[model samples]
Target: SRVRFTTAEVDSAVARISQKIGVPASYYQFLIPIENFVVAGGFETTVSGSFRGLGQFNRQTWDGLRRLGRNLPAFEEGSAQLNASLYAIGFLYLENKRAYEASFKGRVFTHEIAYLYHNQGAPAAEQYLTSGRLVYP
Candidate 1:
């Protein structure tokens, strides 16, 4: 549907999703929009590239998202993109929660740890965490 949205719309949807998902709205507030800009230029733009959507899915992740009922075409849909991205973030957090908790002295995982696992995968994050190296924010 070649979805686009205003910043207000994006912010509203993000708040709704955060409330629905039981995550701290602030946790996603800063990072998701920044990532959205990195992925699609801004809330209003839909630039074409290897990555798609607010979450910046690639070919593999895009195909995988089909299982969650989001296809490549729907990645452009603003609401769908935001929802799917949140879901993906939650799923990634669950997958890597233990590593993050252990690395951070059993504290709840933050977006920094989650994004590290997101970009570098679990094993790499663990190694970096153990080595006292910082992963990019």
Candidate 2:
């Protein structure tokens, strides 16, 4: 099913969220369209039978943030951009970086790693970095 939210709307929404969280505006400015294009779908979709929203959050992951006491948009879910914000920052980059640093010392996480973390998971992301396994391959 198609969502009502537009790319430009989501673009600025993401920028607003990023700015509020102390991230750069330009960081996800381009990514909004890119993700919207590449992953390329609506607010209510499932890829490989996965999940929904711009964040593409599965039930487990969706409930995860809420379980942390973070209240996402109660009214306009897909339109709110909080899901997408977390897609780029919350669990993807920030927590993923923290976990990566904890697991593997003497190394830092990259933006690309955040991408992997968002989609595949920490184990796959870590394996991709350490062994270049491309198990997703």
Candidate 3:
């Protein structure tokens, strides 16, 4: 039971979240589409019970973010899911910034790389970036 969104609707949602936080709105251009395609754009979404909400967060991961003082709403609601997903994206971007800087050796970090880490684990994304190849696990 996935809901389809118009381009404007998607853009607006992404923009709303991006502006609320400081993350660039452009990042979601790729992220939203990929995530929606992989899972679906539903409020009560989860990749099993492990990943929930729009960001598809597991309890432990969400709790880890919460320990850092970030707050997220219940995954059962659509607005909460959207907001939480955006917040999580910002958290992850900052979380990985140091490693991304070290791995790229001062090259400007791209959302593509950020998403690689978001979808794949850091070590794997780092390896792919270091090798300059698209190989994946």
Candidate 4:
């Protein structure tokens, strides 16, 4: 099912869960998906770095995304724009938000990777992806 918790509700849930699990409240909060993209819905993530900061890395990344779809479903240059915006979201949250400031870079990378797989024609049935950990060489 789809669940959208308000910031306060989320905080409360985290607090309750932290107590039960014997973890810090903020630790529980940090463990939530850096961004969660329901297979049937849009993406969700935190603030991030600027496209201006990413430059060539950004271009290569979008080119990689565009390559995911063969023709009709493929995102054009527009996909690059979307990726850039998402990155900025991660960067800003990491930079400014006390909860996320320390680890935003790593979190942003994971969130973006999930999004790329989702939009790049990854089969809708695939629930989770390995970041090629087993055979990356």
Best by lDDT: 3
User: All models: lDDT?
Assistant: 0.59, 0.54, 0.64, 0.34
Between candidates 3 and 4, the one scoring higher on TM-score is 3
Candidate 2 Cα deviation (angstroms), residue 86: 5.7
Which 10 residues in a row give candidate 1 its minimum summed lDDT?
Answer: 70-79
Looking at model 3, the pairs that clash are none
Scored by Cα lDDT, where does model 2 land? 0.54
- What C-alpha lDDT, on a 0 to 100 scale, does residue 63 get in candidate 2? 60
What is candidate 1's CA lDDT for residue 104? Answer: 71
> Which has the greatest TM-score?
3
69-89 in candidate 3: lDDT tens per residue? 777654344223455666776
- Whose lDDT is higher: candidate 1's or candidate 3's? 3
Candidate 4: 10-residue stretch with minimal lDDT: 47-56
Mind giving the per-residue lDDT tens digits that candidate 4 earns over 1-137? 22333455445545654454343444323433334432323333322332211111233443553464422112223223333333322322232233222423444333343334323323321223333322221
Q: What tens digits encode model 2's per-residue C-alpha lDDT throughout 1-137? A: 43445555556666667766655445455334435534443222223234555555665666665566656542235323444434434534456667788877986455555667777777777777678654332
Candidate 2 regions with alpha-carbon error over 4 angstroms: 24-35, 38-50, 73-91, 134-137
**In model 1, what is the error at residue 136, expressed in angstroms?**
12
Instruction: Quote each prediction's TM-score.
Output: 0.63, 0.65, 0.69, 0.25
